Amino acid sequence: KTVVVTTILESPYVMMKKNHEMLEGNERYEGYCVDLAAEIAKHCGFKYKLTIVGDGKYGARDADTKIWNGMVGELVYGKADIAIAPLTITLVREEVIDFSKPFMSLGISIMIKKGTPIESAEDLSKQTEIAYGTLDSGSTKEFFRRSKIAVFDKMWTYMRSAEPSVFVRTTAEGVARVRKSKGKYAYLLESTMNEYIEQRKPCDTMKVGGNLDSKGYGIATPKGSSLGNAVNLAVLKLSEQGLLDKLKNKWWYDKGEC
Amino acid sequence: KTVVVTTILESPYVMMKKNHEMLEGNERYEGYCVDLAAEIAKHCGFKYKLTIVGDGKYGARDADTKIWNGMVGELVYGKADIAIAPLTITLVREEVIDFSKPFMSLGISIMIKKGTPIESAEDLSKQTEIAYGTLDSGSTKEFFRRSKIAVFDKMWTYMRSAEPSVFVRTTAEGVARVRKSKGKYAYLLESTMNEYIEQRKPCDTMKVGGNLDSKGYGIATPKGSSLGNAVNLAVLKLSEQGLLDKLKNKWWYDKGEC
Numbered sequence: 001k002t003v004v005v006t007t008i009l010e011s012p013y014v015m016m017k018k019n020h021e022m023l024e025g026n027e028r029y030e031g032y033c034v035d036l037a038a039e040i041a042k043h044c045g046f047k048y049k050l051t052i053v054g055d056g057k058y059g060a061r062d063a064d065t066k067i068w069n070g071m072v073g074e075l076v077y078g079k080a081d082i083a084i085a086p087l088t089i090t091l092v093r094e095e096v097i098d099f100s101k102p103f104m105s106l107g108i109s110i111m112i113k114k115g116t117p118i119e120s121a122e123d124l125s126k127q128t129e130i131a132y133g134t135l136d137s138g139s140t141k142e143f144f145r146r147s148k149i150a151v152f153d154k155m156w157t158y159m160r161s162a163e164p165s166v167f168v169r170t171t172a173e174g175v176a177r178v179r180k181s182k183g184k185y186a187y188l189l190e191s192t193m194n195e196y197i198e199q200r201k202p203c204d205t206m207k208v209g210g211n212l213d214s215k216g217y218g219i220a221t222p223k224g225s226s227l228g229n230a231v232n233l234a235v236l237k238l239s240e241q242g243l244l245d246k247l248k249n250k251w252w253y254d255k256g257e258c
Numbered sequence: 259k260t261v262v263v264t265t266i267l268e269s270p271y272v273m274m275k276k277n278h279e280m281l282e283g284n285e286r287y288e289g290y291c292v293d294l295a296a297e298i299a300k301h302c303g304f305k306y307k308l309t310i311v312g313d314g315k316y317g318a319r320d321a322d323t324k325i326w327n328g329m330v331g332e333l334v335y336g337k338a339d340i341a342i343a344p345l346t347i348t349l350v351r352e353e354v355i356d357f358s359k360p361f362m363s364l365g366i367s368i369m370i371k372k373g374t375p376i377e378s379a380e381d382l383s384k385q386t387e388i389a390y391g392t393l394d395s396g397s398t399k400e401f402f403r404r405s406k407i408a409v410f411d412k413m414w415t416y417m418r419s420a421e422p423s424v425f426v427r428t429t430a431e432g433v434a435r436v437r438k439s440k441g442k443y444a445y446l447l448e449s450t451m452n453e454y455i456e457q458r459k460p461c462d463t464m465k466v467g468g469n470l471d472s473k474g475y476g477i478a479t480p481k482g483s484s485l486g487n488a489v490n491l492a493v494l495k496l497s498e499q500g501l502l503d504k505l506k507n508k509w510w511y512d513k514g515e516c
């Protein structure tokens with residue numbers, strides 16, 4: 001049976017290939033995770049079909065209804081067999097689905113326009129001139145909503161009660177806000193996405209500070225799935241052979257424009 | 259029933275407290291892993307005895323007989339119900355034991371005496387005057403034995419055939435050799451341990467270059483054990499509450515000497 005693979009559109013993990021309205025199947029796509037789905041598949045020995053996630057979110061449980069949206073949801077309600085994507089391993093998610101070991105490391109970092117008077121997270125908390133928010137429906141938002149640290153609680157208290165909303169719907173949207181906002185908007189996003197943007201034209205963004213925390217992206221399968229075992233091992237193999245780090249070079253740096 | 263926790267002596271994960279003879283049971287020990295295991299045991303609601311693995315090793319497999327030694331063996335062969343140490347998640351191990359998600363990140367690094375004319379793993383591979391070795395029966399040794407990267411196979415080639423042996427039985431021995439060799443021995447060891455040593459008197463060693471790869475420390479449990487699960491959620495919990503980041507700063511940095 002062809003494995004159905006859910007994933008989300010996020011450069012440079014998965015990206016529409018210049019000509020698509022063309023080729024077809026999995027060929028439509030390219031990017032770090034597309035490349036990873038290929039070797040994963042070969043080593044586990046299965047055929048697969050990439051499909052992009054509907055609502056285009058990563059996945060939170062909606063407090064109201066208690067329904068899972070996003071890629072996590074696609075797994076939880078049986079619409080897919082596996083998620084290969086920038087999907088953060090977190091306690092709440094590990095409760096409803098199974099995670100492989102991490103294939104990539106990352107942490108919550110700050111993005112600012114170059115020339116912004118900001119050096120750290122402590123720095124953002126101590127001020128009002130510069131607004132900051134996070135993506136909606138992701139790890140980073142929850143990280144704040146649930147944190148017990150001095151700086152991170154205040155930061156949250158601000159973000160949840162600010163108007164207009166400091167939250168964006170997509171990473172692209174949050175990046176464009178930084179640029180358009182003339183250095184009066186910082187964006188809290190994960191490190192890997194920061195470092196990637198920092199390397200793209202027009203080169204007006206930059207990542208400042210040390211990460212606020214430490215975590216990783218795992219590949220996801222339905223809780224109690226049989227793939228969960230092979231897939232995991234596939235990840236370990238590919239890591240020790242050097243693949244994951246060779247691929248990070250290919251999509252992050254060997255492509256640099258800065 | 260009391261959970262037998264196996265572990266190894268390795269600064270600053272597990273250490274004999276300055277009252278080595280005067281105290282008893284778990285009290286004898288202090289350190290990063292001693293604190294971690296305490297919170298693990300609190301959050302999973304069990305009691306435990308810490309014992310130190312006998313052959314003071316981490317765990318490799320005899321190619322002769324195929325028997326496991328060190329902590330991996332203590333799990334494999336029933337002598338212990340869990341291993342709480344700086345034990346590295348690798349692929350051969352993950353075949354015979356279960357690993358929690360990472361609780362700490364690390365990579366392979368070079369330690370040299372200050373002043374040594376080395377900058378990278380490649381610089382080492384390009385000469386013979388300076389000898390370089392690694393801990394025996396560890397993740398690192400296996401990394402080289404199994405690496406297909408040009409620079410690492412040539413390193414492995416030199417190490418596997420060097421005399422006197424470039425290998426060492428304890429990280430402590432490896433360090434001693436670096437110091438006493440007047441900069442003619444370098445030691446390939448894990449970034450974590452390196453960062454720690456760097457900040458202790460006599461302050462004569464120094465981490466160099468970047469990390470030769472990425473990986474992590476996991477809590478291991480016998481394949482298909484009941485603790486395996488509880489233990490994992492426990493790690494995930496503690497990582498979010500920040501404890502792991504707080505713990506690390508206590509043992510590595512609030513402990514600095516240079």
Ligand SMILES: NS(=O)(=O)c1cc2c(cc1Cl)NCNS2(=O)=O
Nearest residue numbers: 101102105239347363472473474
């Ligand atoms: N250094 S890390 O925690 O980001 C990491 C851990 C593992 C990887 C990859 C990374 Cl980057 N894959 C192989 N095994 S692991 O310990 O889960």
Ligand SMILES: NS(=O)(=O)c1cc2c(cc1Cl)NCNS2(=O)=O
Nearest residue numbers: 089105214215216359360363497
């Ligand atoms: N970035 S990492 O691979 O070193 C890492 C991964 C995890 C942590 C902590 C770290 Cl530093 N704990 C929570 N879940 S995780 O993905 O296993």
Ligand SMILES: N[C@@H](CCC(=O)O)C(=O)O
Nearest residue numbers: 058087088138139140190
């Ligand atoms: N990548 C995150 C969401 C985006 C963010 O919060 O930065 C996740 O997998 O949940």
Ligand SMILES: N[C@@H](CCC(=O)O)C(=O)O
Nearest residue numbers: 316345346396397398448
């Ligand atoms: N942490 C390693 C041992 C130390 C090393 O290999 O440098 C292991 O789990 O085997």
Ligand SMILES: [Zn+2]
Nearest residue numbers: 016018020021
């Ligand atoms: Zn298009």
Ligand SMILES: [Zn+2]
Nearest residue numbers: 297301499501
């Ligand atoms: Zn606690």
